[PDB]
Structures are given as C-alpha cells and as structure tokens.
Design a protein around this nucleic acid. Structure first.
Ligand SMILES: [Mg+2]
Lengths: 51, 236
RNA sequence: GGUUGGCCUCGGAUAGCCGGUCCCCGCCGGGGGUCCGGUGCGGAGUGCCCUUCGUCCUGGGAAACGGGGCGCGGCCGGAA
RNA sequence: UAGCCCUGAAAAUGGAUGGCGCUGGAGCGUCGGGCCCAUACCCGGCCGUCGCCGGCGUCGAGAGUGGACGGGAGCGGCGGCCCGGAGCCCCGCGGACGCUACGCCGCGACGAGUAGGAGGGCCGCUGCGGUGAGCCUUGAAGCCUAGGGCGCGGGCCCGG
RNA sequence: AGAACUGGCGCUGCGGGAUGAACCGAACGCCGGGUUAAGGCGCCCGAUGCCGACGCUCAUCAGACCCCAGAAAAGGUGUU
RNA sequence: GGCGGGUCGCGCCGUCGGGCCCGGGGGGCCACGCGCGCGUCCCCCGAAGGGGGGGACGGCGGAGAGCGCACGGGGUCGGC
RNA sequence: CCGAGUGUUACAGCCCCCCCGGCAGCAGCACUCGCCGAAUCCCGGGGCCGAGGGAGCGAGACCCGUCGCCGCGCUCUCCC
C-alpha cells in the first residue's frame, strides 16, 4: 500500500479529478502571487516617485 | 518530431489540461481510419554431394546445470548509475573555493572548476600553490566556502572528462609468483599528457587568483580545527 | 589514554574598574581632589600562538635584539 | 475570616522527602512550551497458530464468464476485368521450476498463563517383525574435547 | 469479623509508585524504526543546560506528589 | 382594540439555487464526420396551422492502425 | 536670572478619555492579535531506519516477460 496525499498517481488511480483539482490550484496561487507581488511594487513605486 | 508542447509547472503535472491539449495538438483533424531469418543457407562444398546446408545457427546448448533459479519480477523502473540524475548544492557554483575533507590532501583548499558528467566534481587548487592536480572529488566530502573567484569565461578542455580520470588495470597473470601483478609498484609516469593538460589551466587561473590580494596565501594554507573553533558556530 | 597552550589581584554586589597632581610609609606602596570606560572591549561570548606544505629565484614593509642549545659558568626566586 | 510558617508535638541500636542535598527554589499553589521511555500504539522483517482459499489445465497450444454451423438476404475489409474466398502452425521441430495431493502456494487476523485438557515430535531409551546387496579389526560400542556446525527446543551430526 | 456490585490478585510478566501480591498505566511470539501512557526531567539517573510566567513561605522540629506508611482540639501584634 | 398561527401579493437581501433558461449586444471544459433526418428544444420569416437554420442526444439514418517514448505506475537496483 | 523638587484650585495654554460626521486600503500584518481553519492547499528540501517478493490472452513466442493498471508526451496533417 502506497500513500495517497503523499505521492501522485496513487491518488490518480483512485481519484482522477485530483489532478485537475491540483493544477487548478497551482495555477491560481501562482497568479494570486503575481497579483500581490505587483501590488506591493507598483504601490511603493509611486511612493518612490514622490520622494 | 515536435517538442513536448505542454509546459510543466510541477513534476508530472502539465499546465494545459486534457481537452486543452486536444486542440493544441489538433487531434481533431488527424484522427484516423487507415491501417524471422533463422539464418542463411550455406554452400555445399564437396565432391559427390549436393544439398546446401541446414538453416541453423546458434544451436542448442551442450550442457544444462543440475538446478536453475526462477526469473525475477521486474517490479518497476530502477535505472542504472549512468542515467540517474546529477545534483549539485546551491552553495557550489564554479569558481568556488572548496575544502578537501577526506583525501590524501585533508584540508588543502582547492578551486572548483566543473561538475563532471557522472556526479564527481572536477577540481584543482593549482599545483604551484597546493599539491592538488586536476583530480576528481566527491560532492559530499567537501565544504563550500562562501568565497569564490570569478572564472566564468576561462576555458575547460572537452577531452578531460570522467573516463580521463580513471584507474588502470588488466588482470592477465593468474599464477602465484612473488611479484604483485608487475604493475602495482609503479606510480604512473603517464603524467606526460596530464602535465600538459594542467599548464593549459594552471596558466589561466593564477591571473584570476593573483587579482584579489590575500587569496594565493589562503590557498597555500590548510584547514584545521584548533581549540574553540566549533563548526555550527562558523560561517563557511 | 589523549590531537595546541592562558605563567595566578583582592573582591564588591543598593556597587565596581582604570589612569593619574598633591599629602605619608623603607625608589616602591596608602588617602583625597581630577579624568575615564562601564549590560563589563585594559571584555576567558576573551587573549597569545595560530588554519606553518616545504623550498627556490627575487623586490618592498618591518627588524639591529639575534633564536632554536646536547653550550659553559654565575646569581636569587620559589617550603602549603 | 483563611493561605503558608510556628506553638501544641515525648521512646527506647545510628538514620532516612530514596539518598546527596535544595532557600532568586531542587519548597508550596496555579499554569505554559519543549523534552525522557514500556513487552502499550503505528509501519516493516521473521516464526508459529487459527481462519479463508488456490492449483489434477505439465494444456508451448489451453485460450473459454454465452458459443455453433448451414442453409434465404446484407454492409465494411481483403487480391478488378463493378463479378470473385480458409489457408489446417512453421525460415528455427523448440519452450525454465513444479503437484511426498498426508505435498505445494496465496491472503488476513491473532500469540500471557497455574491447576487441567488436547495436538505434533525427522525428540530420546530397550527389545521384535520387515528392510537398507547398511556399517565396521584399513577399528564397533563406550568415554573425553578451548575442534566444526545444525535445530525455537527435546536433541543430533561431524573432527580429533 | 461478615455480606452486595464490579474489577483485580491467585494464574501475570512489563513502565511507574525508591522498596513492594492487590495502587497507577498497560497485558506479553522474535526484532528494527517511530510515537506515547502513568510518571517524570539539580546530581545519583534517560530527560528543563527553558535568559519559563504569577504569587506565597524562614522553621533553633522547614517543606517535599493517589493507595502510603505519622497527628488533633486550641492559639500567634509571624507574615499574606 | 391589541398578541400569535396558516395562506396570497409587493418591493428588498445575500460569490443563493435551478448546469437552467431566453434572445441579443477574455478565462476555463475526461467535449470534436463535415454531409443531413430519427426524435426533442430553440431561433427566424410574410403569413397565419409551412419551410430554412441552430443546440444537444441515454438511438441509428449521417455517424481504424499502434509506432517507437518517458513514468511519484503490481515491495531497489547500479549497464557505480 | 535660570533650573529642579515638593504641596494647593485649577480643564487647554503638554495630554488623555467619551460622543456625533470621515479618508489611505486594506492585510489575524511593521512576531500579540497571536484566533480558528484548508474541495476555504499546495510547493520545495534535509535527518533516520528499511528493501520483504515465470506479471508475456500475444508472437505460435526463442540471447533478451523495460509487462498490467494509472497519468503523460511524439509521429503517421501542415505552417512559422
Ligand atoms: Mg482509575
């Protein structure tokens, strides 16, 4: 017995939706990362434009 | 033969889904409907005789052993050492000064050049400063010092590789006579090609070493734990 | 069995440490004014060696004691 | 009024928060975060037992969880002068182990024990019927052994 | 001394209670890794060698961990 | 003239729900015989009880061949 | 003259609190709001112990079960 929640494709032999559940959540927390990294820069860039 | 057309982001999870790759591959318009030599015969070769000889080579064996073991069970992929992967530490980039922990050298400070094709990492703290020629070392028996030297466009010879730095042996004599293999007393004087291979790189790292001031005496030095010098308290 | 040694004030703790003009105890020590530093940097979270591969050629900084001694001789120091 | 400490509080060998000992606690109360280990728990290896089975197909030709033929009509795929039909192994004559069926193989759960009860003993002793074309004066039994091992054990084999 | 209900000891090792029939944890084939239970972590003795938190307490007889192995009424301008 | 129970209707709520829908004016989808006829639904058009489209189908009219890879894949191998 | 330390009644001429109307743009965040969590969750890495055990529905196999399930890409279209 191998461990689902620990290796891929033992999840996917048991639950095929767990792959597209996983790249739908690696995509969106890669774009929420970009949405917050660009927000922290472009706010304090205009702050750096003043002083 | 195109490339993989599906950029990974996590190991074994492509970015584009199954249906999104059905339209990137254009599989809609390439769906389909369409659809020995045992040996050669030999010449006869003889008077009063015809009948070109039998179609058989690689004949049945002359002997079977009295017992045999069952076949293995294949289990998975467990690929051999020539194919595994090559892993470095992030603290080891080329030019870095290393510390030899377990060699004959044992604390001589060396200059890292290249990680070779089968895991061992090619290194020389140059023979005029250390006594370290172009030896291989192993990754987990050195200490990456946080000082480096910028050698990012020096040269490295393509001919010196993993099969260059190997040890040599050909076991012909099996007879018990008082010489030990007749080639084991002899330190190799095949250095006459390896010496030329060092002066190609001994004469282009000492410009880099003699640019930053104290470093050539640092490389002459050796490393030693002395009294209250504790590792885990030491920034390497 | 061990992988370099520290050759040393008293001590106080609601207080200590150092450097120093003058007033006294056979050229040292006690007192006070004066200046310091003080989560101790004249800091054993330290300091001296050192992590010294050797040698050769060959210039600068330092250095005029030589430093290792199986030398030779003399001194007085140290009785828990 | 109630927390701690004190008085009340005396016993016979020398002595007991376990001892040394502890008073910015090593005491008492209320709690925090780490950390230490049982034969307990989890994962793995092995032994045995219980349970549930597998394999007579050694079937390199068995191919089989619905298969026939063969007749009256039909589409696809095969070799065309829009008409058409079984090829039964072969260029290799080959293809591991196995099933003491009272034996082999698999899977899962379990394992304390007095009195007591069963099972197995290829444990051991003495004699008898059979049997090893057994074994030996080129050395049997017996006894000795810092010799070599085997079995969970009863015990046993070998060397000198 | 004699009963009721349940568990245990007898028949039962193991961790802890220093010590142990019965307390507390936990029941046991032969071992490796992990983690805990009850109990603990100054040193015997594994682990607080945490920059642990708040208070209380001075004993010329201090206190110190279920069973459990020593105390009462009464009293103190001793301290909170 | 006050206090509750059941029902109808009004506007107002919420990442409501119905995959809803319905005509119109970038991201995701384990979803892919153009031709046409088998139903169903929708959109059209002047009429007014008919054709031309579209969407989807748990059924039929339209509606095969694996070729060499790589692998968190039926309990570790090295062609170190 | 300045400064300090005390004691009064005194309410902005340090400040603080409670109200009626706001903004930046909000962060369980510049380690005290640390809360409680993950179909509202995933990625990457280091330490240790372990490695127990004739799968070919095809070819009539032939040096040689890189085989089943599972997820994946490449070609049998073309262009840049
Ligand atoms: Mg209880």
């Amino acid at each position: 017995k191998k461990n689902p929640l620990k290796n891929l494709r033992i999840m996917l032999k048991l639950n095929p939706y767990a792959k597209t559940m996983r790249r739908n959540t690696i995509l969106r927390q890669a774009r929420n990362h970009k949405l917050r990294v660009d927000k922290a820069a472009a706010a304090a860039a205009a702050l750096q434009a003043k002083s | 033969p195109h490339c993989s057309r599906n950029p990974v982001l996590v190991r074994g999870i492509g970015r584009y889904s199954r249906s999104a790759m059905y339209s990137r591959k254009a599989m809609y318009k390439r769906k389909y409907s369409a659809a020995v030599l045992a040996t050669v015969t030999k010449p006869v070769g003889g008077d009063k005789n015809g009948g070109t000889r039998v179609v058989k080579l690689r004949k049945m064996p002359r002997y079977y052993p009295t017992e045999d073991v069952p076949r293995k069970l294949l289990s998975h992929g467990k690929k051999p050492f020539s194919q595994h992967v090559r892993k470095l530490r992030a603290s080891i980039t080329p030019g870095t000064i290393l510390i030899i922990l377990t060699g004959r050298h044992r604390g001589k400070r060396v200059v890292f050049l290249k990680q070779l094709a089968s895991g061992l990492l090619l290194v020389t703290g140059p023979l005029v400063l250390n006594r370290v020629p172009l030896r291989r070392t192993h990754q987990k028996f050195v200490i990456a010092t946080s000082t480096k030297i910028d050698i990012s466009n020096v040269k490295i010879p393509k001919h010196l590789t993993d099969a260059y730095f190997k040890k040599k042996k050909l076991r012909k004599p099996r007879h018990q006579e008082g010489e030990i293999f007749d080639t084991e007393k002899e330190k190799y004087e095949i250095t006459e090609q390896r010496k030329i291979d060092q002066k190609a790189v001994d004469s282009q790292i000492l410009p880099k070493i003699k640019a930053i001031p104290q470093l050539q005496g640092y490389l002459r030095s050796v490393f030693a734990l002395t009294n209250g010098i504790y590792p885990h308290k030491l920034v390497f």
